[PDB]
Symmetry: C3
Subunit: 137 residues, 3 copies
């Protein structure tokens, strides 16, 4: 079985909202269409164990994000932004078992820690892939 | 073949010891039981090449950790903690060939750089998985 | 199919050049020889989708790097180095589809942000692996 995606954040002057999934609308690879660039969500179609990774640029505010499965935090990450003139960075990752229709996305969990960023020479990426399948009848 | 795990650090007021593996006792996924949440060690049962990743929160002290194979550093990582009021972050990762009974874990390598952290909205994760097997007779 | 590698940066007093790939000449694993420790480049021999990750130590200058495919930026990353006495850190990663003869490497994209580092207890690693193949006739 196969399932993989990777996408990047678009540049924006709008402070990132913290009441919806973080958007990663510039798709690098999504051959199964399991990631939805409009909603920011990965939707599982193959039961199995997956790795997810976020590699974010942090600027103008601290960044707190949760990797979530159906709304539940799998793992939470944070980077302090101490009033610096240029960006910092924050990565997070974890593995999880998924079943078909389960969804995974990234979301700010503490609503003012919204400092995810992209610019001409900086990106924030969200990637995930099936490591092994585990189908059952 | 299949082998994968991911686990997170528990919250604790105890400064992390630097004379034993770092603990990640909150298991996200460990379907083969190849990771041991009591010892903090992954023990290989399938020869092959693996990826390991640590995504850590850093607070109250700088953090230095080694990804180790049987006690030997595969790769070492560090993040300065400059007297900030909230956490920083540190990720590390590498690939390695393992044979059955080989063990991989995370450990502080410089014994005062013990700033690995977890809290209600921050985590430190340790994950690893088989990318391909290479059995021989 | 199989393809994987991981390598680390050597210690050096020379400020890193920004007109060539960043070198990672200490090989951890490269069983197919798809990575070239002399050039710093991975060259694809199996069509498919790959994950790449860089886990860098940052010291003496800020670090900006691009993960590149044939010279084109897949994704760009940055970490501010604010005049601190010890290193910071920066990770980046993404997935990409490759075909045979495509090359992937890491390079400084803004030519003074050259702060990638290694020392006795710090490393910078570059890793990548095939997640699934997609051969065609």
């Amino acid at each position: 079985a196969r399932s993989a995606f990777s996408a990047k954040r678009s540049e924006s002057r709008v402070p990132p909202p913290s009441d919806a999934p973080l958007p990663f609308d510039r798709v690098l690879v999504n051959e199964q269409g399991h990631y939805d660039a409009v909603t920011g969500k990965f939707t599982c179609q193959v039961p199995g164990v997956y790795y997810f990774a976020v590699h974010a640029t942090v600027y103008r505010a601290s960044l707190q994000f949760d990797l979530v499965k159906n709304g539940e935090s799998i793992a939470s990450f944070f980077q302090f932004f101490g009033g610096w003139p240029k960006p910092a960075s924050l990565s997070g990752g974890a593995m999880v078992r998924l079943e078909p229709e389960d969804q995974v996305w990234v979301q700010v969990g503490v609503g003012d820690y919204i400092g995810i960023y992209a610019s001409i020479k900086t990106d924030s990426t969200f990637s995930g892939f099936l490591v092994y399948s585990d189908w059952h009848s």
